[PDB]
């Protein structure tokens with residue numbers, strides 16, 4: 001048993017809710033919140049901008065030190081950093097950005113990072129400003145992640161479409 005509340009169960013291990021991931025993170029304080037990161041960990045907008053804003057820019061400060069030491073992530077890759085006031089840890093995961101021409105096939109690799117964590121609160125990777133079809137992202141999530149994932153979908157119309165179209 002865990003403290004996630006109000007989720008619809010899609011599969012044995014995937015759950016979904018219409019929620020703002022920032023407010024969900026602040027309420028639950030999960031062990032792991034997933035950020036929709038880019039390779040430079042520049043948290044300017046979308047989920048990343050919102051998570052970073054909620055940390056009063058501490059996520060960005062930590063991220064800039066990470067990049068200065070390690071260089072950029074790979075598309076499809078991840079790193080574990082602090083969750084600040086939102087979670088114990090933040091798993092920064094880079095899904096492909098279709099608006100940059102990045103290979104949508106890398107979305108499966110991106111979701112494989114979730115399997116290193118028993119339970120996660122997460123957005124749909126490559127959705128929103130990353131330009132992929134969220135219905136496809138949900139399908140890849142369900143077919144790739146084997147650990148317990150609680151998906152937060154900000155947009156109510158999209159949430160309803162994801163549920164109603166789920167196979």
Ligand SMILES: C[C@@H]1CCC(=O)N1Nc1ncnc2[nH]c3cc(F)ccc3c12
Pocket residue numbers: 019020021022045046047049050123124126127128129134152153154155158
């Ligand atoms: C990209 C995915 C696909 C469907 C969807 O809604 N996405 N985004 C979110 N998902 C969950 N919480 C969020 N909080 C946010 C706060 C923001 F400023 C901006 C975006 C989000 C957001």
Ligand SMILES: [Cl-]
Pocket residue numbers: 045046047127128129130
């Ligand atoms: Cl977005």
